[PDB]
Ligand binder design. Structure first.
Ligand SMILES: O=P(O)(O)OC[C@H](O)CO
Ligand SMILES: O=P(O)(O)OC[C@H](O)CO
Ligand SMILES: [Cl-]
Ligand SMILES: [Cl-]
Ligand SMILES: [Cl-]
Ligand SMILES: [Cl-]
Ligand SMILES: [Cl-]
Ligand SMILES: [Cl-]
Ligand SMILES: [Cl-]
Ligand SMILES: [Mg+2]
Ligand SMILES: [Mg+2]
Ligand SMILES: [Mg+2]
Ligand SMILES: [Mg+2]
Ligand SMILES: [Mg+2]
Ligand SMILES: [Mg+2]
Ligand SMILES: [Mg+2]
Ligand code: NA
Ligand code: NA
Ligand code: NA
Ligand code: NA
Ligand code: NA
Ligand code: NI
Lengths: 247, 251
């Protein structure tokens, strides 16, 4: 059941996104082959309601296209180049569907922390469509963790697939962290590294919760935070972080 | 007055002040909106590293200042050394990141209404709203409209908890299928949507149910006029004076 029972120390942030284009099959393959145990990727819907893997509202940063992804049909998305901005050898990469990403992730036996990143207002539809795909295609023997910054997304996730573990994403640790985690029924708090507080973290851990932090790309900082009780980091250079731990 | 702000909603709101020409979210853009005769402004609020409400849009400093790093982790004294105008134009070189207090001073001078968008650091919603409410309860003129809005759930819950008499708007990109449930849940009197998600059928339903509908960010006067004709109550614009002129001259 709970993905947190299998939480590794290092999670590849948007796949192995330091050296391959974020949120692509390429970055998922790289994470898989680098021996990273879990990936994190972001999910939202295309204009025609299909779960796709992408971070920004707009297309221009990570593709050759322009406009709102939320307003763009999958068929149009699929002819954009989602890799060349990272490097020309990735020019065949496209925005993956959630289904496509699942196939690659499961090939390597990796866990998936799917960050629900719905278009604001489209939380219910985004979670519903993502849950449908996952219920029929995600392997029961691999860890699946939902997380979100978005309250409605977390409520919907619990409503539509309660057995799947949930993490609450924040930047700063809320003063009311306990009441929020209890209310949202989340087993983990995922925080921004700049807001790590060893004392608050110790209290959160004392209370039985996992604590994770993003996005850590410096080996020394990762090790510093693990020593202070951080359960996992999200990293763009996950192989480098793991090399540091294992040394 | 400040309560029931939607009763005083103009058709045009200056998005981050008059931000097409002047640097967004500065005293300059607020003065420009005032001088252009715009009736309300919208500006974004969050806390400095030392807990002071400041007017700023991004998490990071580099887009609209010569600074670097997270505004949430930077003390006010350090923020005030930053140049928040040169990126827009050399004439704006002296502009700083305003405190909410400083912004209120300029806004009130022109007798403009304020739609304050609560943009707290995620997780710091309760502290951000508390700090902002303190400033406003002390300094916001009671005879000018004040509207809180946010994309953030906990921000809207905190606003109602700490100062229920001030009207609230729910910011989204798309109109939720459960818009009615949401607006009643959050106790909001208006829905603010992204222009690309304007849906005349849904908007008519929302209007008929007693809520205001606003859209951002519209800089094309022809589009603005079409949307008003289809029931939209207000636009947020970077060129609010141009939109107003289109409204006033339409035959
Ligand atoms: O990188 P973001 O903006 O998707 O957020 C940080 C992590 O991804 C949370 O899962
Ligand atoms: O421009 P944003 O990103 O602050 O979007 C919300 C609009 O400003 C309307 O409040
Ligand atoms: Cl780092
Ligand atoms: Cl790496
Ligand atoms: Cl008006
Ligand atoms: Cl920066
Ligand atoms: Cl200039
Ligand atoms: Cl009150
Ligand atoms: Cl426009
Ligand atoms: Mg993410
Ligand atoms: Mg591009
Ligand atoms: Mg275009
Ligand atoms: Mg395929
Ligand atoms: Mg705003
Ligand atoms: Mg100029
Ligand atoms: Mg200066
Ligand atoms: Na859980
Ligand atoms: Na500080
Ligand atoms: Na000048
Ligand atoms: Na639409
Ligand atoms: Na536009
Ligand atoms: Ni004061």
């Amino acid at each position: 059941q709970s993905a947190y029972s299998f939480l590794p120390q290092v999670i590849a942030h948007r796949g192995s996104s330091g050296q391959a284009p974020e949120n692509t099959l390429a970055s998922l393959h790289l994470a898989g082959q680098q021996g990273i145990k879990w990936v994190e990727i972001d999910v939202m819907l295309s204009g025609d309601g299909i779960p796709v893997i992408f971070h920004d509202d707009y297309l221009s940063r990570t593709t050759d296209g322009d406009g709102l992804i939320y307003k763009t049909p999958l068929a149009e998305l699929k002819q954009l180049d989602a890799g060349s901005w990272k490097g020309q050898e990735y020019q065949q990469e496209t925005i993956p569907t959630l289904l496509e990403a699942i196939e690659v992730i499961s090939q390597y036996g990796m866990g998936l922390n799917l960050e629900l990143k719905p278009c604001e207002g489209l939380e219910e539809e985004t979670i519903a469509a993502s849950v449908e795909v996952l219920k029929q295609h995600w392997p029961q023997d691999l860890p699946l963790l939902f997380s979100s910054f978005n309250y409605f997304a977390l409520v919907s996730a619990k409503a539509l697939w309660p057995e799947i573990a949930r993490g609450y994403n924040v930047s700063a640790i809320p003063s009311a962290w306990q009441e929020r985690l209890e209310h949202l029924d989340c087993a983990g708090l995922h925080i921004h590294q700049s807001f790590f507080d060893v004392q608050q973290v110790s209290d959160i851990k004392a209370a039985g919760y996992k604590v994770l932090a993003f996005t850590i790309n410096d080996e020394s900082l990762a090790l510093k935070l693990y020593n202070q009780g951080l359960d996992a980091v999200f990293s763009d250079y996950p192989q480098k972080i793991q090399s540091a731990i294992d040394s």
